[PDB]
Amino acid sequence: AGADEERAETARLSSFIGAIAIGDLVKSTLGPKGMDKILLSSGRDASLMVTNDGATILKNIGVDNPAAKVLVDMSRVQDDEVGDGTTSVTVLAAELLREAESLIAKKIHPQTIIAGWREATKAARQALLNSAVDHGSDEVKFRQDLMNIAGTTLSSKLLTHHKDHFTKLAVEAVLRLKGSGNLEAIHVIKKLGGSLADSYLDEGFLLDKKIGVNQPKRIENAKILIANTGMDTDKIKIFGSRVRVDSTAKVAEIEHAEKEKMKEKVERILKHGINCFINRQLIYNYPEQLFGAAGVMAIEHADFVGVERLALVTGGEIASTFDHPELVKLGSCKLIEEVMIGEDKLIHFSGVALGEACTIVLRGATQQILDEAERSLHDALCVLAQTVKDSRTVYGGGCSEMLMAHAVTQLASRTPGKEAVAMESYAKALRMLPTIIADNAGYDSADLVAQLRAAHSEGKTTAGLDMKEGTIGDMSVLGITESFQVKRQVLLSAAEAAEVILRVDNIIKAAPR
Amino acid sequence: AGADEERAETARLSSFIGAIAIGDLVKSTLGPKGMDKILLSSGRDASLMVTNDGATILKNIGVDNPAAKVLVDMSRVQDDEVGDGTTSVTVLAAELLREAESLIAKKIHPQTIIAGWREATKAARQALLNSAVDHGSDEVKFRQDLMNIAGTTLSSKLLTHHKDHFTKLAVEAVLRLKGSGNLEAIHVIKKLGGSLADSYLDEGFLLDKKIGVNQPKRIENAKILIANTGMDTDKIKIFGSRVRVDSTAKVAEIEHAEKEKMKEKVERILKHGINCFINRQLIYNYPEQLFGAAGVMAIEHADFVGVERLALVTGGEIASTFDHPELVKLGSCKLIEEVMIGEDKLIHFSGVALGEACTIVLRGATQQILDEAERSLHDALCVLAQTVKDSRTVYGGGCSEMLMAHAVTQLASRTPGKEAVAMESYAKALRMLPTIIADNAGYDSADLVAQLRAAHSEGKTTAGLDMKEGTIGDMSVLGITESFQVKRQVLLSAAEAAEVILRVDNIIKAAPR
Amino acid sequence: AGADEERAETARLSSFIGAIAIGDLVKSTLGPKGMDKILLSSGRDASLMVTNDGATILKNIGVDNPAAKVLVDMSRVQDDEVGDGTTSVTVLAAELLREAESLIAKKIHPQTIIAGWREATKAARQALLNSAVDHGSDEVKFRQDLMNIAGTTLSSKLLTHHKDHFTKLAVEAVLRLKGSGNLEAIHVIKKLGGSLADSYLDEGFLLDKKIGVNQPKRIENAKILIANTGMDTDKIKIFGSRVRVDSTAKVAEIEHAEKEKMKEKVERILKHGINCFINRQLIYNYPEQLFGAAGVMAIEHADFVGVERLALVTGGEIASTFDHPELVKLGSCKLIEEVMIGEDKLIHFSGVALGEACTIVLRGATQQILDEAERSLHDALCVLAQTVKDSRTVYGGGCSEMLMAHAVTQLASRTPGKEAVAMESYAKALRMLPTIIADNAGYDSADLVAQLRAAHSEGKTTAGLDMKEGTIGDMSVLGITESFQVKRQVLLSAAEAAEVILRVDNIIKAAPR
């Protein structure tokens, strides 16, 4: 048959090619002047996805045979710890494969060279000494809440002309979120219109459905009903086949039975004073006539994900068969109404007593870039919760990377044996990041490298790459910072994950049969 | 994600080819001396649609592999807030791509060039309150209602022989339309008969269906009935079957049962005085005999879309089972009748109490060009609605474009570094529009550009391109003006769309919102 | 009719293709960090020619049927007038052709776009009065003699690590060469000896030859004899034959006849006082013994090219048979001697009375680069001779081109006619030169262009592109200046040369098509 077999140089080469291919696409993604990439694949993809988050696109697809999918999978676990900000951890790992060329110069004994990873453990340690931090971002926090890392995550994204304002908003969202609750009840949608703020913060939950042309305009002292099962009745598990009833008049009682479903709903409804009904599916027509006259606003086919979020908000409900009304369900009563946002009419749920579950509605120019905000908000909500939880962060704009590079250069000379050659190669890897951040800015990379190394060497952690300036500047004034644990995990994960493939001589596999 | 391997220059090329391909076809369309269009297709299109309206044809079909459909999709967003006058936004976006050829020689960072478009935001902003325009557009209006912009939209259309008269009619339609709601209930049907006027204005809604050969021809103080459920009775999705009866005698009872459905329909139809019945679906034969004697006109398989507009028109009604008559149904009473309009017979609904919903009927010479009128009306309606709310519009015929171009030339040398190269290129883009407008006119474009610039530079905003003359003339007498928001949005939109083209690795198909 | 067809759209393409091919090879050559290129040819080519100078290689070969050879022929006439600096004139004409793709899209009179060249002539006046040049170089001149244009001319050449010192020497050579005297009389040879100076200036003509080990070391009050006919005697017009004589001893008279040949040489020689004899060919041994005893130094197989310059230098002579001596021969008498230069032995002719013929001797490492000095020197001599007599020059480093570019852009929009589209295209041509000078430097081209325009726009003529700096600086401090003739001839010629290529077809002689 033919399971994939590779010999001597080729086995190493397959690993080599996978790392180089990923680096070129990801490099434009890094730092405050990144680029949007879209990709198209065959069926079960439904077309094009545009991702500015490097981890999301790699995780989703196993495009081809060459190994790289496993290296990609690990980055998600990093994401649980913190993840995002900007993607760059993958890029450094790729760089390590290129020096494998110098390895044939030493002619045949790589395992000893593998000591470089042990060396990397030393390189990682001084990255924790060098390249300062911030102090704590202790809790809720006034000014220090944002206008920092979220802005940087956004900076690589172009939407930031007005988006950076949006990013600032997300900290407020995280502050309410924080507690033993963990991550739940956060929903976001973008709306057509035109405002400078480009976003509204809702104390409650936001939907987008209407009962029908008829029904009262507004409800007060509202009671909310949520039903798991649809209002539709007739087909059931077994049809009961084709009926055949002696005579034919009896079939009429079946119609009468339908009336009973109508009647049960009205009797439970009137006593409660029910102001709204939300059903996650198709809704039967008889009920609809009833709701309009009563003065009750109902929702058809509301998405299930929105409903779960809403239950935490209103105190929840049991959600069973039509017995579901009254005390088995809890209703929050502040105010539910249909409100024109500006140009487009939507329905707002607000005034929730609980207060720790909220919905943010975004506004904007109206296009792919606004959907870009969908990309951005998701990153902003998660980053800030982590920043408080970690209690540690590092300076952004590549400030962290150059100082670490200064420390590693002397390491190569200090070690004697097998450790020394490998140690310096790891050290040079850090150099490209300063170059990549500057290049996307629109300024000459050579000049940038020169001034950058000089400032970090002196001992100023705050100083970094300033793209706006065209040279270097004070990162802290900008407010750009990176979460501390993003750096810890990359240092151990980048080294060992890359280490496994260089170390191993082939990939035997197995044929399907 | 990731399948279509195109990179940098080749990737750029696909974007490049899409813009040039669409620019030549739309080029004819922009001025008063535009041309009509003929299209041929296979695969359920059944007929050739003649469309010089660039937006309509571009939306209907995604003809080939190179990307452009998403770019195309966006122009419609422009359309609800305005859309037309003449197409042009697509041309400007395309023109930017061709100088990208000089940028490969440049060989640096595509993104650095992009700063010109952020600069273009300045151009967008300063192209606002800079142009000098007309105010007025009070409300309703005396003689400025039309013979202006609708005529210009039409001029680019082949129909402007008989048709310019048709356009004049459309503003009368918009005057009734003003209020809050913008575009609900506006319907237009082509007529194959011949009239010099070429149009008839109906005070109500136009259909094109008939009950049958028999039935009263005219009804007065008409009551309107709409039923969700069909008149037909028998199978449902649970079968009565094709039943078993013991001695033929009992088959008779089934026949009798049919009579009962007829009885319900006649007994309460009479009390109301029912003059017309409209049902969206198949109608059962028994009632048909009944309606003729009663003096009631019914419509079999009426189209649902017509019905919804009609409901808003009548005052609305609750549609259910045969209980539907009297109060649950609201009937508007004026005049319902079938009137022959010079050729193919139609049914006319008129005298609507609401007044919000109205129908416009067109007549013509009788040809492909006549079907063209359907195409022209859609553009005519949208312009006027925008003209009243904006309260601001700009001089047409390219008057706006030359003035802005003179101002932007100064800007390029004056601005610092990267800004200078970017701004200068944006300024020259405006120059092509004068050339495109002159070329379709029948006069020499080269001569036209120079003469055009001298008048605009001087300070006369009214002066612009006169296509029939072939030289520069006074735009205001001509009546060509463009809505103020057409210019605000195009300026901001053109810069954002061009900017993303260089950045993205691959193009392919639509998905955003 | 069999010869090649090709008209309008097809004919234009052949011209288009020729221009693009030449531009890519020539762009590398321009400026201080330019590059050396070679070509390989077979048949009647004994060498691979490395030509830094664009004009020399283009003239030499007509490789194929496609457009280029006639355009090429024009540059040499320019060389006679001034020629060099850096090769930019061909590049500017080639980029003109790129706008033509836009022109086909334009769809008007292709002939009208021709008016652009007439427009270009107007642009030429723009160049003449919108810039400040230098107002220096009155005659001989102290400091301003060099460290200027020659350095830039040599800038494109690799061997400039020590060469700029040599370039500096070239002006001194022209100072003696200036005046009524002819422009040839200049000889250059590279030596294998090495020193920091790398070159020596001689008072006269340098030659590498020796009679033999015997003969006096130095001659004074020297008289010089040059003979067309060789010293060799025996064969005559018609084979004497393979000849037998009456006796063995009668062959001796034949030997005796040789003695007579000897006797005539000395008799004429002694009276004159003949210090040195130079013969351009083979020399017979018998006279050689005589010269040693007499105290006369002779030269075997002296190269003819050295001799022609020498005749002008000494005063000349009529070179005939041995009737050559006395009055028919003219000889100058300062000093003729052989010293020692580095390794190789050379003979120095110096102190010539005429003074308008002089020799420069170059010393170098050995390799390709020393040969490169031969390329280097040739374009150094020509520049200075033009520089002294013209009484004008322009600022170097591209200072002249950007200022003119600022002046030209306003004019295209302001000037009425077919002129407006045509003139603007000429203006953008100037933009590339700043880019080409910067690109060879290696700095990012866009940043460079942009920064450059702001300083020229301001009004500082001295400011220009400083490659060493990486930005912009004061050109005069560097001292770099360009000959005035290069700017006047290029502007008149470029418009005429550009008009003609579009006008023609096939591109002068080879085979059909």
Side-chain angles (χ1 to χ4, degrees), chain A residues 25 33-42 45-49 57-58 60-61 63 158 161 190 192 213-214 234-235 239-244 247-248 259 286 289 365-369 371 439-443, chain B residues 1-4 7 70 74 77 80-81 108-109 111-112 114 118 228 237-241 243-244 250 253-254 257 308 318-321 323 328 418 496 499-500 502-513:
Chain A
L25 290 310
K33 240 110 250 264
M35 290 123 228
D36 290 340
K37 300 290 180 176
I38 60 170
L39 293 170
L40 180 277
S41 54
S42 206
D45 288 290
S47 280
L48 280 70
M49 290 300 290
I57 181 237
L58 277 329
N60 290 339
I61 199 70
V63 170
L158 196 85
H161 64 118
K190 48 137 205 56
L192 300 90
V213 170
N214 64 90
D234 65 300
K235 70 198 309 95
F239 290 90
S241 310
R242 290 170 177 72
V243 190
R244 210 270 92 86
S247 303
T248 227
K259 298 290 180 181
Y286 287 72
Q289 290 180 89
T366 218
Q367 70 280 340
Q368 180 180 339
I369 300 306
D371 290 340
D439 180 90
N440 60 40
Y443 290 90
Chain B
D4 190 340
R7 290 180 300 204
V70 300
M74 190 270 146
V77 170
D80 55 52
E81 60 200 73
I108 300 170
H109 200 240
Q111 290 74 38
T112 300
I114 292 308
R118 180 170 68 183
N228 290 340
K237 70 160 40 93
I238 190 170
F239 290 91
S241 290
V243 120
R244 169 240 120 190
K250 190 170 280 314
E253 79 180 350
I254 290 240
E308 290 300 300
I318 300 303
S320 0
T321 60
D323 290 339
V328 290
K418 51 111 121 280
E496 290 300 300
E499 180 180 350
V500 300
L502 290 170
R503 290 180 180 145
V504 181
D505 60 340
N506 70 20
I507 0 110
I508 300 170
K509 300 330 280 68
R513 282 180 180 99

Side-chain angles (χ1 to χ4, degrees), chain B residues 20 24 27 98 101-102 105-109 112-113 402 406 409 413-422 424 428 431-432 435 439 443-451 453-454 457, chain C residues 20 27 98-99 101-102 105-109 112 402 406 409-421 424 428 431-432 435 439 443-447 449-451 453-454 457:
Chain B
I20 190 170
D24 290 340
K27 180 179 70 56
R98 20 260 40 166
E101 180 61 17
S102 70
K106 184 180 180 91
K107 50 180 180 280
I108 300 170
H109 200 240
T112 300
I113 290 300
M402 201 281 120
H406 180 70
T409 207
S413 69
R414 180 170 271 268
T415 60
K418 51 111 121 280
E419 290 171 0
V421 70
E424 180 180 350
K428 65 184 280 177
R431 180 78 300 112
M432 181 180 180
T435 300
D439 180 342
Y443 292 90
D444 210 63
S445 299
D447 180 349
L448 180 284
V449 170
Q451 61 180 15
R453 290 190 290 197
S457 292
Chain C
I20 190 170
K27 70 190 190 64
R98 280 87 260 213
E99 290 81 40
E101 180 61 10
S102 291
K106 188 180 180 56
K107 301 164 91 302
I108 330 140
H109 322 158
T112 299
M402 195 279 124
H406 180 66
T409 159
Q410 290 180 210
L411 290 170
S413 180
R414 180 176 280 234
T415 299
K418 300 180 300 303
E419 290 170 80
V421 170
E424 70 180 350
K428 70 190 290 240
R431 180 76 296 112
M432 183 180 180
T435 300
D439 180 290
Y443 290 90
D444 190 340
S445 300
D447 180 41
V449 170
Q451 70 180 340
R453 290 181 293 198
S457 291

Side-chain angles (χ1 to χ4, degrees), chain B residues 211-217 287-293 296-298:
Chain B
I211 335 100
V213 170
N214 70 340
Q215 260 96 39
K217 190 170 280 176
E288 300 300 300
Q289 290 180 67
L290 180 67
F291 281 90
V296 180
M297 180 180 60

Side-chain angles (χ1 to χ4, degrees), chain A residues 101-160:
Chain A
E101 174 60 33
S102 70
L103 275 69
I104 70 170
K106 291 180 180 296
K107 70 190 295 85
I108 73 102
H109 187 237
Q111 20 264 58
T112 300
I113 291 170
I114 300 300
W117 289 259
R118 186 179 290 190
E119 290 300 300
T121 300
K122 270 280 209 165
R125 180 180 70 72
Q126 60 180 234
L128 300 180
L129 180 61
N130 290 330
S131 170
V133 293
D134 70 340
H135 199 270
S137 267
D138 44 290
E139 218 275 286
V140 168
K141 190 70 180 176
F142 299 90
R143 180 76 300 169
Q144 294 295 130
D145 199 0
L146 225 157
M147 291 180 69
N148 290 339
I149 187 170
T152 240
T153 300
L154 275 70
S155 296
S156 70
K157 300 180 180 136
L158 196 85
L159 67 190
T160 314

Side-chain angles (χ1 to χ4, degrees), chain B residues 297-487:
Chain B
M297 180 180 60
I299 300 170
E300 190 251 310
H301 199 266
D303 290 340
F304 181 90
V305 70
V307 170
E308 290 300 300
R309 290 180 180 144
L310 192 288
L312 180 260
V313 170
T314 167
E317 60 199 0
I318 300 303
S320 0
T321 60
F322 299 94
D323 290 339
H324 50 61
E326 30 130 16
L327 290 8
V328 290
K329 290 288 180 280
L330 279 350
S332 60
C333 43
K334 190 267 180 295
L335 180 66
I336 300 170
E337 62 180 283
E338 180 180 90
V339 180
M340 290 180 180
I341 300 300
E343 180 180 350
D344 190 347
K345 70 200 310 176
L346 313 118
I347 190 170
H348 293 90
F349 180 90
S350 70
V352 30
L354 180 70
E356 186 69 36
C358 291
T359 300
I360 300 170
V361 180
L362 300 180
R363 290 180 189 193
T366 76
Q367 50 180 210
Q368 180 180 270
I369 293 170
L370 180 60
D371 290 340
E372 180 180 350
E374 180 180 350
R375 180 180 70 187
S376 180
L377 180 69
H378 180 85
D379 290 339
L381 180 277
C382 290
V383 170
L384 290 310
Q386 290 300 130
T387 300
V388 61
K389 290 180 180 265
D390 63 350
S391 278
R392 290 172 70 184
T393 70
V394 300
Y395 295 91
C399 290
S400 296
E401 290 112 76
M402 201 281 120
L403 180 60
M404 180 180 60
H406 180 70
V408 290
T409 207
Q410 290 180 160
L411 291 170
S413 69
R414 180 170 271 268
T415 60
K418 51 111 121 280
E419 290 171 0
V421 70
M423 187 170 280
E424 180 180 350
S425 66
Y426 180 90
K428 65 184 280 177
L430 281 320
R431 180 78 300 112
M432 181 180 180
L433 290 93
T435 300
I436 190 170
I437 300 300
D439 180 342
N440 60 40
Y443 292 90
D444 210 63
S445 299
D447 180 349
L448 180 284
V449 170
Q451 61 180 15
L452 180 67
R453 290 190 290 197
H456 290 82
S457 292
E458 180 80 70
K460 290 180 180 176
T461 62
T462 68
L465 280 320
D466 190 340
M467 290 170 260
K468 60 178 71 176
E469 190 162 65
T471 62
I472 62 170
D474 190 340
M475 180 60 50
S476 299
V477 170
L478 291 170
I480 298 114
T481 190
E482 290 180 90
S483 295
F484 180 90
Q485 60 267 130
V486 311
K487 299 290 172 187

Side-chain angles (χ1 to χ4, degrees), chain A residues 85-102:
Chain A
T86 60
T87 56
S88 37
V89 309
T90 300
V91 170
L92 290 68
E95 290 180 7
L96 180 261
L97 290 80
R98 273 89 277 202
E99 290 80 10
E101 174 60 33
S102 70

